[PDB]
Symmetry: none
Subunit: 117 residues, 4 copies
Amino acid sequence: LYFQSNAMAKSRLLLSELLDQLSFALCIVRNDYVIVKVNEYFESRVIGETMQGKNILELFPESADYLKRKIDTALVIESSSFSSEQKPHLMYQNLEVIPIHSEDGTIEHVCLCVYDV
Amino acid sequence: FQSNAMAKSRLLLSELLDQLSFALCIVRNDYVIVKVNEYFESRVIFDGETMQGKNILELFPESADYLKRKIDTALVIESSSFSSWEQKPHLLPFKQMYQNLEVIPIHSEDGTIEHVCLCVYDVTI
Amino acid sequence: ENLYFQSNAMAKSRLLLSELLDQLSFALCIVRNDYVIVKVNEYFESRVIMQGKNILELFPESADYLKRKIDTALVIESSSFSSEQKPLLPQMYQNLEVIPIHSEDGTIEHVCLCVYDVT
Amino acid sequence: FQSNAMAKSRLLLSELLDQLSFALCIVRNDYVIVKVNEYFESRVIFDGETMQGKNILELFPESADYLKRKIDTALVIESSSFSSWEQKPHLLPFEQMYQNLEVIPIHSEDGTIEHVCLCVYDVTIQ
């Protein structure tokens, strides 16, 4: 580590570890279950043409029951959820669902985050 | 209220990680791959498992010429180098834009370069 | 952010890294049953005016709240993510996280403390 | 138990951020400070509010000579530079350790270099 090159490498390595640790899947779903926004991370690590602008329940029917509920919950109770095996075609995965309030106060969107464990 | 706060937070975090992500690979003197990061794995047809202990020149022959010169430069002048990617066959896909390549020598206890570190970055203009 | 020149890209890259670290930055120390501090963040030390001191002796106004939260974790043997604090450590909220540390035997000799900021 | 998984996790993260953190400062081409890290503030006598709209060369006079040569290099050769901090008085106050300095020019739409970025990195040997 006496050479500046080594220091440089260390940094790059550490940043790579930090980034790979915080890496998570993210998309935003409209209240008709369509995706208005997604991670390069989600798109590059799961399951046609592109995820942007289509149905989540139809993209992952293997967990469409589980998903509908977790989304439906958010927009009705209007709060975040946090769930505990595997819930996507990517020990397991954790899911987080945040409702997004419009300026009037109505939810028309939820944020979906899946974390690898 | 607190919901948009959480949402905006996850959104921001996500957007920084997407913009800071880069490919990283470590190779021996013989151009044998010893380490690779998740971003690298996901942008080549190969898994990191098969790539372990393979020669990067052999694994990517369309970029071998360019890559060898770049690695060899770092081995001989004994210092890191940073530049955009000169040669038309890119090692990695992009997903007008371009790619920077960084090459960093790793010195042994004795002083000699025994590994070198490659990082590829993606820029959109 | 006129990223056509390569120097501009590097500067963007650094500013972004800086932004991320600012975001993730938090205060961490580790105390034992004595309430003595045996480990602490550079972040923590650079943000309050430390190793070997008593966490309660250091922050007098908060001492009441701090003891509770520490002693909770070790009795439940589980974690305590919480906000509530009035008299916390140097509105703009500060969330607190306490995590027990099971020693080789199984009994808890330490807890981790984490304080976070929010805009 | 699960408790140790969380602790080690926070410790890991915490030690990663300690090692990746660096001081960052943007200066106009007349040496006037435009933007600065929280991490930079914490390690100088000044605070961010006070520093903004002031000349770096005036704020750290014992370092001005070295800093001007570094910033001017960027300004004239139109390129970034990276080296250890070579002058005896270090800008920032942090088993021997040493500091690295990176100067990066920033081009305007026109082409002209109107700001430069400064980043000070801390290394630790042995």
